[PDB]
Amino acid sequence: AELTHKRRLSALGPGGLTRERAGFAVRDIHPSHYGRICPIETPEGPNAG
């Protein structure tokens, strides 16, 4: 649980978004993530993605 909580990275935050003010297709696997962001990986709750 650590590691994965260090090398976690996040989109939100001051500078980021909010959950609301950003919806969906901004949560998806832009095909550039490949190799760079485990797509398998996400809370959910709203925070998916």
Partner DNA sequence: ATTTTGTAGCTACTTATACAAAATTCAGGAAAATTTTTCTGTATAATGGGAGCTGTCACGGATGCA
Chain residues that interact with DNA, rule: CB under 7 A: 17, 20-23, 25-26
| Between 6 and 23, CB nearer to DNA | 23
Closest distance of CB 14 from DNA, Å: 7
The 3-state secondary structure of the chain reads CCHHHHCCCCCCCCCCCCCCCCCCCCCCCCCCCCCCCCCCCCCCCCCCC
**For DNA, which is the closer residue by CB, 1 or 9?**
9
> Cβ closer to DNA: 26 or 48?
26
